[PDB]
PDB file of C-alpha atoms and ligand atoms in Angstrom:
ATOM      1  CA  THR E 975      11.300   3.047  15.378  1.00  0.00           C
ATOM      2  CA  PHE E 976       7.632   2.228  15.120  1.00  0.00           C
ATOM      3  CA  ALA E 977       6.378   3.433  11.768  1.00  0.00           C
ATOM      4  CA  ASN E 978       9.830   2.881  10.302  1.00  0.00           C
ATOM      5  CA  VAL E 979       9.709  -0.968  10.193  1.00  0.00           C
ATOM      6  CA  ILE E 980       6.922  -3.328   9.358  1.00  0.00           C
ATOM      7  CA  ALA E 981       5.767  -6.184  11.589  1.00  0.00           C
ATOM      8  CA  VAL E 982       5.755  -9.342   9.421  1.00  0.00           C
ATOM      9  CA  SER E 983       6.096 -13.101   9.662  1.00  0.00           C
ATOM     10  CA  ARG E 984       9.391 -14.772   8.922  1.00  0.00           C
ATOM     11  CA  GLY E 985      10.952 -15.287   5.515  1.00  0.00           C
ATOM     12  CA  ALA E 986      13.931 -16.848   3.836  1.00  0.00           C
ATOM     13  CA  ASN E 987      16.853 -16.390   6.243  1.00  0.00           C
ATOM     14  CA  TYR E 988      16.184 -13.517   8.503  1.00  0.00           C
ATOM     15  CA  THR E 989      18.728 -12.466  11.139  1.00  0.00           C
ATOM     16  CA  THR E 990      18.202 -13.404  14.759  1.00  0.00           C
ATOM     17  CA  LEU E 991      19.084 -11.004  17.527  1.00  0.00           C
ATOM     18  CA  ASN E 992      18.286 -13.315  20.569  1.00  0.00           C
ATOM     19  CA  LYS E 993      16.951 -10.115  22.120  1.00  0.00           C
ATOM     20  CA  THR E 994      13.711  -8.191  22.101  1.00  0.00           C
ATOM     21  CA  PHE E 995      13.127  -5.065  19.954  1.00  0.00           C
ATOM     22  CA  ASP E 996      13.395  -1.720  21.700  1.00  0.00           C
ATOM     23  CA  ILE E 997      10.281  -0.592  19.713  1.00  0.00           C
ATOM     24  CA  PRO E 998       7.412  -0.278  22.263  1.00  0.00           C
TER      25      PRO E 998
ATOM     26  CA  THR H 975     -14.924   0.293   5.058  1.00  0.00           C
ATOM     27  CA  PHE H 976     -13.008  -2.614   6.516  1.00  0.00           C
ATOM     28  CA  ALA H 977     -11.332  -4.461   3.585  1.00  0.00           C
ATOM     29  CA  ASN H 978     -11.138  -1.208   1.691  1.00  0.00           C
ATOM     30  CA  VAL H 979      -8.300   0.456   3.720  1.00  0.00           C
ATOM     31  CA  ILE H 980      -5.201  -1.042   5.315  1.00  0.00           C
ATOM     32  CA  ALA H 981      -4.222  -0.622   8.925  1.00  0.00           C
ATOM     33  CA  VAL H 982      -0.654   0.687   8.989  1.00  0.00           C
ATOM     34  CA  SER H 983       1.802   2.649  11.077  1.00  0.00           C
ATOM     35  CA  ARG H 984       2.388   6.286  10.319  1.00  0.00           C
ATOM     36  CA  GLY H 985       4.374   7.767   7.508  1.00  0.00           C
ATOM     37  CA  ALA H 986       5.587  11.050   6.085  1.00  0.00           C
ATOM     38  CA  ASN H 987       2.815  13.608   6.762  1.00  0.00           C
ATOM     39  CA  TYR H 988      -0.463  11.764   7.159  1.00  0.00           C
ATOM     40  CA  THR H 989      -3.673  13.710   7.762  1.00  0.00           C
ATOM     41  CA  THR H 990      -5.103  13.883  11.316  1.00  0.00           C
ATOM     42  CA  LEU H 991      -8.855  13.693  11.885  1.00  0.00           C
ATOM     43  CA  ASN H 992      -8.890  14.211  15.655  1.00  0.00           C
ATOM     44  CA  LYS H 993     -11.726  11.616  15.612  1.00  0.00           C
ATOM     45  CA  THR H 994     -11.959   7.925  15.553  1.00  0.00           C
ATOM     46  CA  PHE H 995     -12.719   5.846  12.438  1.00  0.00           C
ATOM     47  CA  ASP H 996     -16.231   4.643  11.828  1.00  0.00           C
ATOM     48  CA  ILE H 997     -14.748   1.334  10.708  1.00  0.00           C
ATOM     49  CA  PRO H 998     -15.648  -1.258  13.410  1.00  0.00           C
TER      50      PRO H 998
HETATM   51  C1  NAG W   1      17.353 -22.983   5.636  1.00  0.00           C
HETATM   52  C2  NAG W   1      18.282 -22.402   4.628  1.00  0.00           C
HETATM   53  O1  NAG W   1      18.022 -22.186   3.458  1.00  0.00           O
HETATM   54  N1  NAG W   1      19.506 -22.177   5.065  1.00  0.00           N
HETATM   55  C3  NAG W   1      20.596 -21.606   4.280  1.00  0.00           C
HETATM   56  C4  NAG W   1      21.905 -22.421   4.430  1.00  0.00           C
HETATM   57  O2  NAG W   1      21.656 -23.774   3.984  1.00  0.00           O
HETATM   58  C5  NAG W   1      23.043 -21.797   3.730  1.00  0.00           C
HETATM   59  O3  NAG W   1      24.259 -22.497   4.080  1.00  0.00           O
HETATM   60  C6  NAG W   1      23.136 -20.326   4.198  1.00  0.00           C
HETATM   61  C7  NAG W   1      24.279 -19.569   3.431  1.00  0.00           C
HETATM   62  O4  NAG W   1      24.464 -18.285   4.036  1.00  0.00           O
HETATM   63  O5  NAG W   1      21.934 -19.641   3.880  1.00  0.00           O
HETATM   64  C8  NAG W   1      20.877 -20.181   4.670  1.00  0.00           C
HETATM   65  C1  NAG W   2       7.686  16.921   9.732  1.00  0.00           C
HETATM   66  C2  NAG W   2       7.590  17.471   8.377  1.00  0.00           C
HETATM   67  O1  NAG W   2       8.235  17.022   7.399  1.00  0.00           O
HETATM   68  N1  NAG W   2       6.691  18.535   8.175  1.00  0.00           N
HETATM   69  C3  NAG W   2       6.506  19.198   6.864  1.00  0.00           C
HETATM   70  C4  NAG W   2       6.534  20.669   7.091  1.00  0.00           C
HETATM   71  O2  NAG W   2       7.822  21.083   7.469  1.00  0.00           O
HETATM   72  C5  NAG W   2       6.209  21.389   5.811  1.00  0.00           C
HETATM   73  O3  NAG W   2       6.130  22.793   5.976  1.00  0.00           O
HETATM   74  C6  NAG W   2       4.871  20.883   5.299  1.00  0.00           C
HETATM   75  C7  NAG W   2       4.368  21.447   3.938  1.00  0.00           C
HETATM   76  O4  NAG W   2       3.055  21.080   3.602  1.00  0.00           O
HETATM   77  O5  NAG W   2       4.904  19.491   5.115  1.00  0.00           O
HETATM   78  C8  NAG W   2       5.126  18.754   6.276  1.00  0.00           C
HETATM   79  C1  NAG W   3      20.563 -17.334  19.046  1.00  0.00           C
HETATM   80  O1  NAG W   3      20.094 -18.392  19.923  1.00  0.00           O
HETATM   81  C2  NAG W   3      20.067 -19.709  19.337  1.00  0.00           C
HETATM   82  C3  NAG W   3      19.451 -20.626  20.365  1.00  0.00           C
HETATM   83  O2  NAG W   3      20.240 -20.769  21.505  1.00  0.00           O
HETATM   84  C4  NAG W   3      21.432 -20.079  18.952  1.00  0.00           C
HETATM   85  O3  NAG W   3      21.424 -21.368  18.334  1.00  0.00           O
HETATM   86  C5  NAG W   3      22.056 -19.037  17.961  1.00  0.00           C
HETATM   87  O4  NAG W   3      23.369 -19.418  17.670  1.00  0.00           O
HETATM   88  C6  NAG W   3      21.999 -17.650  18.564  1.00  0.00           C
HETATM   89  N1  NAG W   3      22.382 -16.674  17.595  1.00  0.00           N
HETATM   90  C7  NAG W   3      23.102 -15.594  17.923  1.00  0.00           C
HETATM   91  C8  NAG W   3      23.497 -14.640  16.776  1.00  0.00           C
HETATM   92  O5  NAG W   3      23.379 -15.274  19.080  1.00  0.00           O
HETATM   93  C1  NAG W   4      -5.818  17.935  15.992  1.00  0.00           C
HETATM   94  O1  NAG W   4      -5.513  18.093  17.403  1.00  0.00           O
HETATM   95  C2  NAG W   4      -4.160  18.579  17.670  1.00  0.00           C
HETATM   96  C3  NAG W   4      -3.966  18.523  19.130  1.00  0.00           C
HETATM   97  O2  NAG W   4      -4.874  19.397  19.847  1.00  0.00           O
HETATM   98  C4  NAG W   4      -4.105  19.995  17.105  1.00  0.00           C
HETATM   99  O3  NAG W   4      -2.769  20.553  17.345  1.00  0.00           O
HETATM  100  C5  NAG W   4      -4.379  20.003  15.611  1.00  0.00           C
HETATM  101  O4  NAG W   4      -4.453  21.326  15.141  1.00  0.00           O
HETATM  102  C6  NAG W   4      -5.726  19.308  15.314  1.00  0.00           C
HETATM  103  N1  NAG W   4      -5.948  19.229  13.870  1.00  0.00           N
HETATM  104  C7  NAG W   4      -7.175  19.322  13.330  1.00  0.00           C
HETATM  105  C8  NAG W   4      -7.197  19.246  11.822  1.00  0.00           C
HETATM  106  O5  NAG W   4      -8.167  19.573  14.016  1.00  0.00           O
END
């Protein structure tokens, strides 16, 4: 959800979805 | 002031002003 995750830059080895987030 | 607070998402039970912040 929004206000459950934080919007950041990348880091060491994040996991790619090859999608877009459902969070509006 | 700007650079005195942090712009975030919500959290558990923040306080509503029903106004807008004076911070430009
Ligand atoms: C850019 C980078 O650091 N890639 C590493 C990769 O070399 C390693 O094999 C893998 C192991 O899960 O973790 C990630
Ligand atoms: C959504 C949520 O957790 N709301 C709680 C509420 O149930 C509780 O009565 C109040 C006490 O100050 O704190 C807040
Ligand atoms: C995501 O897309 C990239 C680019 O095509 C691909 O190399 C990678 O394997 C994909 N990863 C997953 C988990 O689908
Ligand atoms: C803020 O506005 C909401 C929506 O009208 C209202 O339910 C709430 O009581 C108000 N809170 C304060 C502190 O004015």
